[PDB]
């Protein structure tokens, strides 16, 4: 039944991969940046990047590699989507007309296979004879790069080594060779095989296996003159080529895990390395030429250059310029200097590209009383952590508030003209027995500060041992002014106490407005936390006061204000507390039929419970009796990431598989069995990971609203920085927009020839369903961008229904008007 | 005494919530007021009275009071709604079948969340399942509805089989006419896609094999929505039914009717080459087309894969818990 | 765990029926008629012999807990057979049982079903299920007669005569309260003991222990001849009082 509409307000910003090459012309130097489902093509200049083209694809971009087959003038682009949609693409430009050619395409999914732990890997031969794909444990898939393979047909070679860490095609080999690090019970080893297109199997590889570091992570293919491979770990870097073996183990890299690599000098003399704390290193290959005229690797050296944003991908461009692709914080252009500055650094930032990073939580607040509404996000992680203030003004205006620690939850308290923000920072066990923070951050730079002195958990019979160098999270409640975003106060919670939930509200007959935090005692030994606190704070006159504390037997994953009472979820339990005249929390009633009560939302006396593995539940408070009632459950099991209530009958959910769904009350009340079934009337593959749903709109709707067909407004934040909006439609409007989608999909040419219907199909490893109850507003909003011939082709034979006129033909100009009104909801 | 079923009232249980939609009534989770034990209550509604007390429930009562095994769900008692006072006709109150409460069902564990299954976790799982099936098969009972949802798992690693609603006795001496459509299509054997109608205990073995494969991929093996499409998928893997491998296939009602696209060759070992050797041999034998050549439950327990598994070492499946809450 | 379904002959003088003023002869007659009703109805419907017996065993047990004066017997019998069909997987629609019951009962007898025969029966299912304590599984002398006969080796024709004569004795014992006094295994042996004594056969000769004169003890442990003799006496009592004679 329920009909809804989903549009993008801000496209994915997190950088998911980046390559360089000669894609647009055999002459230009290109930088291709991949954000989730989005490809950005840039041209490298002496000042920075000149953008040239951006396309969307109907799939999450998993593999992106540039290769130049023999006979081609310029590089071609290979992409594989997370649904295993593969394609080869070409850039073609005719004067002012830029388009992307689909040269070959197909889906490489296997009927049977176990998806691998280290994810899809895609590598291409140096000789461009074949494309290698590691999709499933125990299997290696080969797409031969022959001229006739326009469908990208492929075969699997049985692979004995089931648990593969990373694999790359090796340079400087007589036959196509793969070098891979694998894990078996004896540790990790490096092994090589040769790949045979004629025999369609592996043959014994060129050089000997060895046992490598236990945490060996990445494989680097070194080009001639060197040949062979370099293996990056947590503590050591090793180079293997035939019988040659080197190992450098500088103490500096042990401090932080290395995650990305990129070649600087095409000859392999220099490589870039980055680590999770954002440090950027230079890996140097010291050459020694022999009397044979041959060149051998003499030694390896590692030199620290400076600090960059935590980088998911690096790519060196030209001269001293490096592009830093960050998934957790802002991406950058940085220049590497030969001479260090006075602080010892060789790295100086050039440009900063906004990344909303992971949006852990967010709230909508009208800071200026305009009625427009502004969006305050918890964005970024670790040192890239920040708040973001977002308002419409045609682009979005975004203010950034750096925190240098991970923000977890945010909530606005108008009475105090400030925000409350939960945050965690990393300290390391130091020689004092205590801990030391790697850097100062918001919770340490607060004007005034406090620390919980709670004695509740002081009664620990069992202690917990600490080793020097281990990381710990230190959680804080931050009080932040709504005009200056100065950290006015920082409250530090107990040792090993995690802050999980935050609300601002009044309770009972108590006129004071409080900050309330739910916590969990997290010990490495415990699979599931068994201790926790609900803490009532009051922010008054620049100081946070501890008002009351209620001990609980679990983690307070979620809390919410409920008609003057406090609704909190503790592990499996959902509890309702009353606030007494003695300023203490008193339990009224409980619900125990859950696995883990991760998410809570309310409306009136109804409560929506989001569970770890049991989808969504509709609870109701029955005031006559003073307890809970089960209205209905979604017995179709799903792993929830966030939930929201749309109206008294429809409920919205987000899956850990990047899927959205809507459940409704069956409203066919004959048997209790029907009433207690929430039926999944809506299914939609979003492609993003939704952390937070939040009612509100950023548009100026205070008297400027006029009228829109869409009703309601839910914003949501995702891990890749994408912000979207969900809204409801009348049956009439859905049918019109849906019928138009089917017309647009026939007209619009997809990159990679990916069927739009396939892309939006609900998808887990176990199920694939066609989408239902959802209009892809981003497809609808593309009607305005298609050429006039295509618009009129779309409207041919299009009829309206349930209107002033029952059947009414559509013209191309009629739909341009409707779509433009739909673009005004964001 | 403990044996006087049907009299004790459901007042003795505090109802926690509804855990599932059953065949003959809703299933509830509850706590025993006196002991504190958690139980599951299958509600039996005869208020429809089209044919009175459902046979599906009658089967589960008749059989589960006979079957006692660690891997077979236990029916603890039967309790009733407050009965109408002094009237035996106006009473429309329902009966409740009291079972032990199991923490999770297998469908739930896989469909949602990444539950990790190592070789040893699968060994302990399959050994319990097949051992239970052997107990039932030695007692000459056929489950006939083996699905992932009907396999229950406590966090302790104990496995128990659950929904005996479609179970009936099997006589090898006296072949009897049976109901053709018995197992769910995803886990249905080929002979029942061709309509044997006189099925052997081997039907259950095929289902458990489909599970064995599913545990190694986390995805069901034969996902099809129509009877024919299932036979095509089964054929793409196991080979097409033909007298060469199944001499009696020609006797089945639909053999000539439901031909697959090709006469496929068996690829089971190739498309499952990533499975351990001991396991692949078990899968190959369980997923044999001819039910008279398909291994029995006893033979599976006497396999290199399960023979030496020590049941004392439960080896629970890996459950994420706190770590999974926030990625 | 499981309920005890066996009483002593002496205990039958204290059934509810007896204590409401029904005399022993009448309750025996009522049981015979109720049993023969169940037997005849299910036979007309084509029911397996186990299904008939199971209904009869429910019926005989039922009137250990209720009085014949408050529960009309032919309604009870029909209800027993209905459930017995579902238990033993030989099901019938309630409307079909009523149809057959009406064919076989006169107008007075069918009066017990009141104004709505199907209803009077379906409603009783609730009571029967609680009464039998949901012990739906029942074993019958038939299976033990065959399991034990299969282990007899000798003259094929003499053994088959023994089996058919004993089988008839089993069918006749369903009308008696023996179903309530002795486990079915004993019944199967007792009927073998009676058929042999009437056929002047010496069964031990056909056993694996031909010099073990108490041949039955290898089948049923701990059975004194007294028990077998008491059972035999009760079966032949039904034959002598009526006009019918031993099958031979
Ligand atoms: C919060 C919602 C879910 C939480 C609970 C997850 C399943 C609980 N475990 C059981 N599941 C089932 N299966 C049901 C129908 C067959 C549906 O799963 N039957 C069970 C269970 N415990 C005992 N029994 C007896 C009746 C056999």
């Amino acid at each position: 039944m329920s009909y809804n509409y989903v549009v993008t307000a801000q496209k994915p910003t997190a950088v998911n991969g980046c390559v360089t090459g000669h894609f647009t012309s055999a002459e230009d130097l290109n930088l291709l940046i991949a954000k989730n489902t989005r490809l950005e093509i840039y041209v490298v200049t002496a000042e920075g990047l000149r953008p040239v083209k951006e396309v969307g694809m109907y799939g999450k971009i998993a593999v992106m590699e540039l290769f130049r087959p023999k006979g081609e003038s310029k590089d071609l682009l290979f992409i594989l989507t997370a649904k295993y949609n593969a394609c080869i693409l070409e850039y073609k430009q005719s004067g002012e007309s830029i388009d992307i050619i689909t040269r070959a395409h197909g889906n490489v999914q296997d009927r049977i296979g176990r998806p691998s732990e280290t994810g899809i890997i895609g590598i291409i031969d140096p000789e461009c004879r074949m494309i290698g794909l590691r999709l499933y444990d125990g299997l290696f898939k080969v797409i031969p790069l022959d001229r006739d393979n326009k469908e990208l047909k492929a075969f699997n070679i049985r692979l004995e080594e089931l648990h593969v860490i990373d694999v790359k095609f090796l340079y400087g080999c007589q036959a196509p060779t793969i070098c891979f690090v694998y894990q078996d019970p004896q540790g990790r080893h490096v092994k090589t095989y040769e790949v045979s297109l004629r025999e369609k199997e592996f043959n014994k590889g060129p050089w000997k296996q060895e046992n490598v570091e236990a945490e060996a992570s990445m494989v680097i293919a070194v080009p001639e003159p060197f040949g062979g491979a370099i293996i990056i770990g947590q503590e050591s870097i090793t180079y293997h080529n035939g019988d040659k073996y080197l190992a450098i183990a500088p103490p500096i890299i042990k401090q932080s895990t290395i995650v990305c690599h990129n070649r600087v000098d095409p000859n392999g003399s220099r490589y870039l390395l980055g680590d999770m704390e954002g440090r950027l290193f230079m890996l140097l290959l010291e050459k020694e030429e022999q009397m044979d005229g041959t060149v051998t690797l003499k030694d390896l050296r590692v030199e620290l250059l400076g600090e960059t944003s935590i980088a998911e991908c690096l790519t060196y461009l030209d001269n001293g310029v490096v592009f830093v692709g960050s998934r957790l914080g802002d991406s950058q252009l940085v220049k590497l200097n030969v001479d260090s500055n006075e602080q010892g650094s060789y790295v100086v930032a050039m440009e900063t590209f906004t990344n909303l990073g992971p949006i852990v939580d967010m709230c909508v607040v009208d800071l200026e009383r305009q009625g427009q509404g502004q969006l305050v996000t918890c964005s970024g992680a670790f040192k890239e952590g920040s708040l973001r203030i977002i308002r419409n003004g045609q682009k979005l205006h975004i203010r950034t508030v750096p925190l240098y620690e991970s923000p977890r939850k945010i909530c606005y308290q108008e009475v105090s003209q400030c925000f409350g923000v939960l945050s965690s920072r990393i300290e390391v066990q130091d020689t004092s027995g205590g801990t030391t923070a790697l850097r100062p951050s918001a919770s340490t730079q607060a004007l005034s500060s406090s620390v919980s002195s709670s004695k509740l958990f002081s009664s620990s019979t069992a202690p917990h041992e600490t080793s020097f160098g281990e990381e710990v999270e230190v959680h804080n409640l931050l009080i932040i002014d709504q005009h200056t975003f100065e950290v006015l106060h920082a409250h530090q919670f107990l040792q090993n106490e995690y802050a999980l939930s935050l609300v601002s509200c009044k309770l009972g007959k108590d006129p004071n407005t409080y900050f309330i935090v739910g916590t969990a005692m997290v010990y490495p030994e415990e699979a599931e936390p068994k201790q926790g606190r609900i803490v009532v704070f009051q922010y008054s006159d620049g100081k946070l006061q501890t008002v009351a504390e209620k001990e609980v037997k679990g983690a307070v994953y979620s809390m919410v204000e409920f008609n003057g009472k406090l609704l909190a979820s503790i592990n499996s339990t959902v509890r309702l507390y009353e606030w007494t005249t003695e300023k203490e929390l008193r339990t009224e009633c409980n619900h125990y039929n859950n696995i883990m009560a991760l998410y809570l939302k309310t409306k009136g006396d109804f409560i929506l419970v989001g569970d770890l593995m049991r989808s969504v539940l509709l609870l109701a408070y029955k005031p006559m009796e003073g307890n809970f009632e089960e209205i209905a459950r979604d017995f179709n099991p799903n792993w929830m990431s966030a939930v929201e209530i749309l109206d008294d009958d429809n409920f919205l959910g987000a899956e850990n598989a990047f899927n959205l769904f809507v459940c409704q009350k069956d409203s066919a009340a004959t048997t209790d069995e029907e009433r207690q079934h929430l039926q999944e009337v809506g299914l939609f593959h979003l492609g993003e990971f939704v952390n937070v749903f939040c009612h509100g709109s950023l548009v100026m709707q205070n008297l400027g609203e006029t009228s829109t067909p869409t009703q309601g407004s839910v914003l949501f934040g995702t891990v890749n920085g994408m912000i979207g909006l969900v809204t409801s439609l009348s049956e009439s409007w859905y049918n019109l927009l849906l019928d138009m989608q089917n017309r647009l999909n026939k007209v619009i040419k997809s990159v990679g020839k990916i069927e739009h219907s396939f892309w939006r199909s609900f998808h887990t490893e176990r199920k694939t369903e066609p989408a239902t109850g959802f209009i892809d507003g981003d497809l609808i909003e593309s009607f305005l961008d298609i050429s006039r011939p295509k618009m009129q082709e779309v409207v041919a034979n299009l009829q309206y229904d349930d209107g002033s006129g029952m059947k009414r033909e559509a013209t191309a100009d009629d739909l341009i008007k409707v779509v433009e009104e739909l673009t005004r909801i964001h | 005494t403990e044996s006087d079923w049907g009299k004790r009232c459901v007042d003795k249980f505090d109802i926690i919530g509804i855990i599932g939609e059953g065949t003959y009534g809703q299933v509830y989770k509850a706590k025993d007021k006196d002991t504190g034990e958690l139980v599951a209550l299958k509600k039996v509604r005869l208020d429809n009275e089209k044919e009175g007390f459902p046979i599906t429930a009658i089967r589960e009562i008749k059989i589960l009071r006979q079957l006692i095994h660690r891997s077979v769900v236990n029916m603890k008692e039967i309790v009733t709604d407050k009965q109408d006072a002094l009237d035996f006709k106006k009473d429309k109150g329902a009966f409740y079948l009291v079972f032990e409460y199991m923490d999770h069902d297998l469908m739930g564990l896989l469909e949602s969340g990444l539950v990790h299954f190592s070789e040893d976790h699968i060994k302990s799982f399959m050994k319990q399942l097949m051992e239970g099936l052997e107990y039932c098969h030695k007692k000459n009972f056929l489950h006939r509805d083996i699905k992932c949802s009907n396999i229950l798992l406590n966090n302790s690693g104990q496995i128990k089989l659950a929904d005996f609603g479609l179970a009936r006795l099997y006589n090898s001496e006296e072949s009897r006419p049976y109901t053709n459509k018995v197992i769910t299509l995803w886990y249905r054997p080929p002979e029942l896609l061709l309509g044997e109608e006189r099925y052997t205990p081997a039907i259950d073995v095929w289902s458990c094999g489909c599970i064995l494969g599913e545990l190694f991929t986390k995805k069901p093996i034969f996902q099809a929505n129509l009877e024919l499409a299932q036979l095509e998928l089964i054929s793409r893997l196991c080979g097409s039914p033909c007298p060469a491998v199944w001499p009696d296939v020609i006797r089945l009602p639909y053999f000539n009717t439901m031909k697959p696209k090709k006469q496929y060759r068996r690829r089971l070992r190739e498309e499952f080459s990533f499975i351990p050797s001991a396991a692949l041999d078990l899968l190959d034998h369980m997923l044999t087309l001819d039910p008279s050549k398909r291994c029995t439950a006893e033979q599976t327990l006497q396999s290199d894969f399960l023979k030496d598994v020590e049941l004392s070492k439960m080896a629970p499946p890996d459950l994420p818990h706190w770590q999974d809450c926030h990625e | 765990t499981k309920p005890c379904w066996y009483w002593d002959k002496k205990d039958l003088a204290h059934t509810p029926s007896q204590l409401e003023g029904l005399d022993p002869a009448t309750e025996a007659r009522y049981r015979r008629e109720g049993a023969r009703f169940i037997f005849d109805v299910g036979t007309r419907l084509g029911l397996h012999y186990d299904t008939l017996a199971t209904g009869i065993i429910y019926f005989h047990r039922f009137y250990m807990f209720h009085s014949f004066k408050q529960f009309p017997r032919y309604v009870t019998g029909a209800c027993c057979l209905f459930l017995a069909g579902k238990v033993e997987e030989t099901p019938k629609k309630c409307k079909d049982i009523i149809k057959t019951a009406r064919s076989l009962l006169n107008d007075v007898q069918f009066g017990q079903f009141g104004d709505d025969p199907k209803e009077e029966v379906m409603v009783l299912e609730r009571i029967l299920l609680q009464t039998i304590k949901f012990d739906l599984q029942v074993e019958h002398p038939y299976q033990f007669l065959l399991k034990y006969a299969k282990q007899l080796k000798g003259d094929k024709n003499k053994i088959q005569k023994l089996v058919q004569m004993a089988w008839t004795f089993v069918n006749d014992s369903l009308c008696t309260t023996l179903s309530l006094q002795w486990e079915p295994e004993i019944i199967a042996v007792a009927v073998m003991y009676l058929a042999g004594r009437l056929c002047k056969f010496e069964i031990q000769e056909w056993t694996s222990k031909p010099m073990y004169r108490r041949w039955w003890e290898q089948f049923v442990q701990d059975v004194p001849v007294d028990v077998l003799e008491d059972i035999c006496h009760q079966i032949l009592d039904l034959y002598s009082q009526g006009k019918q004679q031993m099958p031979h």
Side-chain angles (χ1 to χ4, degrees), chain C residues 10-246:
Chain C
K10 298 181 173 182
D11 297 338
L12 301 178
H14 304 298
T15 67
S17 307
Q18 292 297 305
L19 296 169
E20 288 192 353
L22 221 64
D23 63 23
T26 299
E27 190 171 10
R29 175 169 72 80
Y30 285 175
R31 286 181 186 272
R32 286 160 26 193
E33 298 176 2
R36 277 160 204 157
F37 171 79
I38 296 167
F39 198 99
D40 294 334
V41 169
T43 302
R44 292 281 190 204
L45 296 166
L47 284 175
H48 192 276
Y49 56 85
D50 275 339
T51 300
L52 305 183
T54 293
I56 293 166
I57 298 307
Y58 292 161
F59 173 96
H60 272 284
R61 291 177 178 176
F62 187 93
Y63 288 100
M64 300 301 294
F65 298 79
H66 303 288
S67 167
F68 278 110
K69 288 187 174 183
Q70 306 201 44
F71 290 87
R73 53 193 178 283
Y74 302 115
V75 183
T76 301
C79 190
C80 287
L81 190 60
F82 178 60
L83 180 68
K86 291 189 285 186
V87 170
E88 303 291 354
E89 306 288 337
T90 63
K92 297 287 181 176
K93 295 182 175 184
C94 187
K95 68 179 182 64
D96 298 338
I97 294 171
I98 298 292
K99 181 178 180 178
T100 304
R102 186 54 173 129
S103 294
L104 300 171
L105 296 176
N106 72 27
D107 291 351
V108 178
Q109 298 167 318
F110 197 83
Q112 293 187 359
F113 290 81
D115 300 341
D116 185 350
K118 177 169 179 174
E119 185 64 3
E120 291 288 321
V121 168
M122 293 301 287
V123 162
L124 196 51
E125 193 182 37
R126 167 184 311 280
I127 293 317
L128 179 65
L129 285 163
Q130 299 185 355
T131 303
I132 65 185
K133 304 178 185 178
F134 284 94
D135 205 9
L136 304 179
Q137 179 64 16
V138 175
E139 303 181 330
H140 301 292
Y142 301 114
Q143 68 175 351
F144 301 113
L145 185 51
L146 298 175
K147 184 179 182 179
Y148 302 166
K150 283 176 176 182
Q151 306 172 45
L152 300 178
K153 293 294 180 182
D155 184 349
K156 159 199 178 181
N157 289 357
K158 288 181 175 185
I159 288 174
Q160 280 189 338
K161 182 180 183 181
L162 183 85
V163 171
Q164 278 192 348
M165 194 170 308
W167 192 283
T168 298
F169 285 132
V170 174
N171 284 342
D172 297 333
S173 77
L174 292 167
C175 312
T176 71
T177 61
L178 291 168
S179 310
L180 306 166
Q181 300 173 32
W182 307 105
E183 288 97 325
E185 296 92 347
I186 292 167
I187 301 297
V189 166
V191 294
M192 295 172 70
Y193 183 93
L194 183 59
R197 148 177 298 172
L198 294 182
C199 298
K200 304 295 180 182
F201 298 160
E202 290 194 352
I203 300 175
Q204 59 274 24
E205 296 292 333
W206 299 324
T207 67
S208 60
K209 308 178 180 183
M211 299 155 235
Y212 198 172
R213 285 174 290 183
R214 296 186 181 173
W215 56 269
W216 60 89
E217 288 173 4
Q218 77 195 267
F219 302 124
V220 184
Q221 291 88 19
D222 297 341
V223 175
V225 211
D226 302 341
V227 168
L228 301 181
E229 290 287 341
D230 185 18
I231 298 174
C232 291
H233 187 69
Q234 298 188 47
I235 302 190
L236 296 182
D237 273 0
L238 186 62
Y239 273 117
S240 75
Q241 76 176 13
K243 298 182 72 175
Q244 215 178 2
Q245 215 181 4
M246 335 306 172

Side-chain angles (χ1 to χ4, degrees), chain B residues 181-307:
Chain B
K181 300 190 169 61
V182 90
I183 324 204
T184 190
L185 246 299
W186 285 6
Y187 300 93
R188 196 175 290 177
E191 61 253 36
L192 292 189
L193 294 179
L194 301 178
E196 173 56 80
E197 192 141 356
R198 301 173 181 274
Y199 32 73
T200 50
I203 58 167
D204 291 334
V205 181
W206 178 277
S207 317
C208 300
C210 295
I211 293 170
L212 175 64
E214 185 163 338
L215 288 172
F216 278 98
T217 70
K218 303 179 182 177
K219 175 183 176 181
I221 307 309
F222 312 110
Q223 288 181 322
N225 302 338
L226 186 66
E227 286 85 15
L228 184 73
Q230 187 83 351
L231 196 58
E232 171 74 8
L233 285 175
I234 292 172
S235 298
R236 278 186 189 165
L237 183 69
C238 300
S240 293
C242 61
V245 299
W246 184 352
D248 302 312
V249 73
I250 60 178
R251 300 175 188 268
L252 294 174
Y254 304 135
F255 169 57
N256 288 325
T257 300
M258 295 177 64
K259 184 181 72 65
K261 180 179 178 179
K262 304 179 179 183
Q263 291 291 292
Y264 291 95
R265 67 181 180 88
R266 189 175 186 91
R267 295 189 59 189
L268 189 149
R269 283 184 174 269
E270 302 176 3
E271 296 203 10
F272 284 100
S273 69
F274 56 86
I275 293 190
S277 302
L280 186 53
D281 195 41
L282 183 55
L283 188 63
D284 192 6
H285 274 274
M286 300 180 73
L287 295 188
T288 291
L289 293 174
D290 189 350
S292 65
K293 304 178 186 184
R294 194 182 305 148
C295 55
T296 68
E298 188 185 9
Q299 300 176 358
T300 68
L301 304 168
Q302 301 290 330
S303 68
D304 287 339
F305 188 67
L306 305 178
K307 171 178 66 83

Side-chain angles (χ1 to χ4, degrees), chain A residues 593-595 611 614 617 630 633 635, chain B residues 18-22 27-29 39-42 60 73 97 99-105 107 149-150 152 161-163:
Chain A
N593 193 32
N594 289 289
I595 308 294
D611 189 278
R614 291 305 171 184
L617 210 183
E630 266 190 336
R633 294 208 66 121
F635 298 109
Chain B
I18 179 172
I19 60 182
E21 297 169 335
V27 187
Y28 301 91
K29 179 181 180 177
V39 304
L41 309 178
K42 287 191 172 191
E60 216 166 352
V73 73
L97 311 184
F99 291 86
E100 51 189 323
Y101 174 78
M102 302 292 291
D103 298 354
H104 309 283
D105 62 321
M107 178 198 66
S149 54
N150 283 350
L152 303 176
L161 206 54
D163 200 4

Side-chain angles (χ1 to χ4, degrees), chain B residues 51 53 62 65-66 93, chain C residues 2 86-87 125-126 137:
Chain B
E51 283 303 321
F53 209 86
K62 177 187 65 177
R65 288 192 84 169
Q66 295 184 234
Chain C
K2 293 290 183 73
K86 291 189 285 186
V87 170
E125 193 182 37
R126 167 184 311 280
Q137 179 64 16

Side-chain angles (χ1 to χ4, degrees), chain B residues 302-321:
Chain B
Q302 301 290 330
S303 68
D304 287 339
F305 188 67
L306 305 178
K307 171 178 66 83
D308 303 324
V309 179
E310 290 195 62
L311 214 53
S312 305
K313 201 171 185 177
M314 299 301 300
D318 280 348
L319 308 155
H321 280 336

